[PDB]
Copies of this chain bind each other. A is one copy, B any other.
Amino acid sequence: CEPSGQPASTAYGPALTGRPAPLGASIDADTGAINFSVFSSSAESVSLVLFTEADLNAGRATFEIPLDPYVNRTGDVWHIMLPDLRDDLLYGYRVEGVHQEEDKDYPGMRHDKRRVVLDPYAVAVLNRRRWGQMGPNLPYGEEGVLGVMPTWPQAAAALPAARGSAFDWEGDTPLNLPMESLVIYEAHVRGFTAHASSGVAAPGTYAGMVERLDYLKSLGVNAIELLPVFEFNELEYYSQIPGSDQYRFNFWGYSTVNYFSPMGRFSAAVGQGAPARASCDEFKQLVKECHRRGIEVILDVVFNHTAEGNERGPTISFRGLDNRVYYMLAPGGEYYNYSGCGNTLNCNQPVVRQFILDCLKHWVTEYHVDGFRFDLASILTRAHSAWHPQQYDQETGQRVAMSSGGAIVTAEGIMTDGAGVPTGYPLADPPLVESISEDPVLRNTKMIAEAWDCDGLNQVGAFPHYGGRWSEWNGKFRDVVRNFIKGTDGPWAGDFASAICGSPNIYANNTPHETDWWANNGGRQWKGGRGPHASINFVAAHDGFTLADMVAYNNKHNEANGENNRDGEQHNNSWNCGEEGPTTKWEVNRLRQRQMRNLTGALLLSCGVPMINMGDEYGHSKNGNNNTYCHDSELNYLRWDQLAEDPHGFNRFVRLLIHFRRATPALQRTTFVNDKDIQWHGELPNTPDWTDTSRLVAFTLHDGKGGGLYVAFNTSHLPKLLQLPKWGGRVWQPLVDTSKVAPYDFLAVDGVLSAEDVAAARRQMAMWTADHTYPVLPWSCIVLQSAPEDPAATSMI
């Protein structure tokens, strides 16, 4: 409120002291001034820097306002208020302080007054407006020139909208659909409509996606999991791929530049010159429209590492604000690398915890988002690295060097979190995860863990989940289903039956392996208290093989990632069904058509929550590449042409199976099935094969009202005759048979089958079903429905 001394300019009035809360740029409700607030415990000086867009493009600042360190600062939070500020300016911060390479008494200090760094709380960011657009060709690294390189030009943050109104939600609320009801579709914003066949107005944008959303409503999906939509740099490592005319993009976006700003290069409007805040409203429009169609939005989020990399990466934000607070560091200043990406965010140090939590609440409150999937979630359980606060000489006024550079170490010099835990140690009770799990703003927000990291920490089945608040990507489900369905000796039959049940062997298991450290110690308290809906089941996802390719290649084919690449999963549990890649051998193609459906049957006929990889609903292929992370091409694009074509009726199959699952409450459970819910069979009723050599799993599943389903997967290379369990006064009726050419693979009424067609196809087999016999082809899958016995069935149609 008081003036802090800095003079007015053409763009704003005399600066005021301002307030530390809220962090970020906000409008003062009293004066209308923009209050600016940014944390840094390590900075000696801080300047607010403002840009016109032209100045920003040119690598030049328009205005600089030095903050008074006595008046424009409260504790570790710097703050200043600028009244009557031109609201089309953009902002950042020049932060001066020590640097370890210029004084080694200060490991972990990495200030650079030549940089202008981004407000971590930036509501929208501008740097480059169009996807793939290179930044300007400035003489970077010279006096007064802002930005790092053409791939990393100067970014700036948008100001709060002073005049004008907010977005009209029209009563929109997050849907709060019960977790167990979900069918999740993993999609990429750009890849969903970037392909020419998409036919939309703004290909590859938030606005483009809205235009094709009816597809996903028609497909029967009720949740979309978006790949990272937080601002990232797709030109991060832009270079020509060695031995190829293609260029290397960071396509997927698992390398976040700013966590509060939506990705501008997914915004049609920003691409066309709109103000940077336009992307905010384009994303709000998208969520609104997903909700109109009964589709939840789950954001994939990456709080385990940032785009700044290690010391050889760019100073964009955290590193130049306060490197010691934001990143996991050893006492020399080296970056712990549990993320496998160069740095590891300091998740559980207090300011960082608050940042992440504020970020999640921001996306829920401002964008009405329904859930978060946390990439490499194990990192969020690890103890942070602490440093003592900087000492200053009262006489000299000067900074005072400390023992071990002020790293809080053990007697053996090992980094510690300040409270006795060695840095990196996985916590039974991580404060961040507890905060996420218990914050009231997030209480109806779904939380999904990918419960491992890149240093071999694996917490699946015992992520700290605070009373059922977290589901987990179930990678065991993926490997089990792939092994069993291709036909593989081992324990895969038993393991598969368990997967059908929602993997209670993983989520309700209270007898950990003797060698599993986590499950025996920190994870033990978390080994129960969850039902099947904690298992996010998937057969494929953005990384790894597609469904089609899983059934077409024994080995990966990542040549397009560049000569001398060592990219992608080695152990794929795949089978090419006879020949590597495309082939005219008919028995191969017959088998692939079947195994696509068998794998999908497994996914959507299991308790827990199925996730579908974009494109696997129509047999999308990446030509055997199991790691398309760098390709801005058809390999990562939804192929609207191939979808229309549906040559062997697979998209119809998937679509109908989705809808059939949604309509079957016995598959959508919050408690595990018991011996009265499900019974196991073989070729004979109640005689399951659990042996190493098993090639058959089959089960009945009751609907609670006397009806129910019979399901069987024959993974044998031989055909089988099944004896069906006899239910008094009832017969089994055909629905799914993967041995049948489409549309008779799925006998449901639709635009292709009439109610007559279906009844006729049921009556055809009436002699087989009445006998309680059903013939099944090798590598095939059956679903039957129990119906009231009607002896007139076997008379004339």
Binding site for B on A (CB under 8 A): 584, 586-587, 589-590, 593-594, 646-649, 719, 721, 739-744, 763-768, 770-771, 773, 775, 777-778, 789, 791, 793-797
Nearest Cβ distance between residue A635 and chain B, in whole angstroms?
A: 25
A741 touches B719 (CB 8 A): no
B764 touches A647 (CB 8 A): no
User: Would A770 and B590 be within 8 Å (CB), given that A721-B775, A764-B744 are in contact?
Assistant: yes
B739 touches A646 (CB 8 A): no
CA distance A69 to B768 in the complex (A): 82
Can you list 27 A-B pairs with a CB-CB distance of less than 8 A?
A586-B770, A587-B770, A589-B794, A590-B770, A590-B771, A590-B794, A593-B794, A647-B795, A648-B794, A648-B795, A649-B796, A649-B797, A719-B721, A719-B771, A739-B768, A740-B764, A740-B765, A741-B766, A741-B796, A742-B795, A742-B797, A743-B796, A744-B797, A771-B777, A771-B778, A773-B777, A775-B775
CA distance A768 to B740 in the complex (A): 8
Nearest Cβ distance between residue A135 and chain B, in whole angstroms?
A: 48
- In the A-B complex, the 10 residue pairs with the smallest Cβ-Cβ separation, listed nearest first, are A775-B775, A649-B796, A586-B791, A744-B764, A742-B796, A741-B763, A741-B766, A648-B795, A719-B721, A739-B767
Q: Hey, which chain B residues are within 8 Å of A586, CB to CB?
A: 770, 789, 791, 794
CA distance A394 to B764 in the complex (A): 89
Q: Hey, which chain B residues are within 8 Å of A648, CB to CB?
A: 794-796
CA distance A742 to B777 in the complex (A): 24
A771: nearest chain-B partner, CB-CB:
B777
A767: nearest chain-B partner, CB-CB:
B739
A586: nearest chain-B partner, CB-CB:
B791
A763: nearest chain-B partner, CB-CB:
B741
CA distance A793 to B586 in the complex (A): 10
CA distance A778 to B721 in the complex (A): 12
Nearest Cβ distance between residue A759 and chain B, in whole angstroms?
A: 11
Nearest Cβ distance between residue A186 and chain B, in whole angstroms?
A: 26
CA distance A646 to B742 in the complex (A): 32
Counting chain B CB atoms within 10 Å of each CB, the highest count among A765, A770, A795 belongs to: A795
CA distance A593 to B777 in the complex (A): 27
Q: Hey, which chain B residues are within 8 Å of A791, CB to CB?
A: 584, 586, 589
B740 touches A767 (CB 8 A): yes
Nearest Cβ distance between residue A696 and chain B, in whole angstroms?
A: 15
Q: Hey, which chain B residues are within 8 Å of A587, CB to CB?
A: 770-771
Partner of A797, one of B739, B741, B767, B794: B741
Nearest Cβ distance between residue A104 and chain B, in whole angstroms?
A: 70
Q: Hey, which chain B residues are within 8 Å of A773, CB to CB?
A: 719, 777
A775 touches B719 (CB 8 A): yes
Q: Hey, which chain B residues are within 8 Å of A793, CB to CB?
A: 741
Q: Hey, which chain B residues are within 8 Å of A777, CB to CB?
A: 767-768, 771, 773
A760: nearest chain-B partner, CB-CB:
B744
Q: Hey, which chain B residues are within 8 Å of A775, CB to CB?
A: 719, 721, 775
Q: Hey, which chain B residues are within 8 Å of A740, CB to CB?
A: 764-765, 767
B796 touches A646 (CB 8 A): yes
A762: nearest chain-B partner, CB-CB:
B741
CA distance A796 to B777 in the complex (A): 18
CA distance A589 to B771 in the complex (A): 12
Nearest Cβ distance between residue A298 and chain B, in whole angstroms?
A: 33
A722: nearest chain-B partner, CB-CB:
B719
Q: Hey, which chain B residues are within 8 Å of A589, CB to CB?
A: 791, 794
B647 touches A743 (CB 8 A): no
CA distance A793 to B647 in the complex (A): 11
CA distance A719 to B767 in the complex (A): 12
